[PDB]
């Protein structure tokens, strides 16, 4: 289980970088924190555009 999760955390970091490219005014840590819950670029992007993060 541990291996899959550590790899997944690397994937989330990458996803946060891709979102930050689009939204440089949004703090990286808030994007990554939201991604922990959503596990989804699309959902976290919805959240940013809705003013939720």
């Amino acid at each position: 289980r541990g291996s899959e999760n550590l790899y997944f955390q690397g994937q989330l970091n990458a996803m946060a970088h891709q979102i930050q490219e689009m939204f440089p005014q949004v703090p990286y840590h808030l994007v990554l924190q939201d991604l922990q819950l959503t596990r989804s670029v699309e959902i976290t992007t919805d959240n940013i555009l809705e003013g939720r993060i």
Side-chain angles (χ1 to χ4, degrees), residues 12 15 31 33-41 43-44 47:
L12 288 186
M15 286 156 68
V31 173
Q33 282 167 19
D34 199 59
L35 282 168
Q36 299 290 353
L37 279 83
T38 70
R39 308 184 305 206
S40 170
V41 168
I43 301 170
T44 288
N47 287 337

Side-chain angles (χ1 to χ4, degrees), residues 1-2 4-12 36 39:
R1 188 179 79 176
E4 296 286 339
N5 280 273
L6 294 176
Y7 186 96
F8 179 64
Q9 288 300 305
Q11 292 279 32
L12 288 186
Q36 299 290 353
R39 308 184 305 206

Side-chain angles (χ1 to χ4, degrees), residues 21-38:
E21 270 197 280
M22 245 176 251
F23 297 99
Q25 74 271 49
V26 183
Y28 184 91
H29 74 279
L30 291 185
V31 173
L32 183 59
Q33 282 167 19
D34 199 59
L35 282 168
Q36 299 290 353
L37 279 83
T38 70

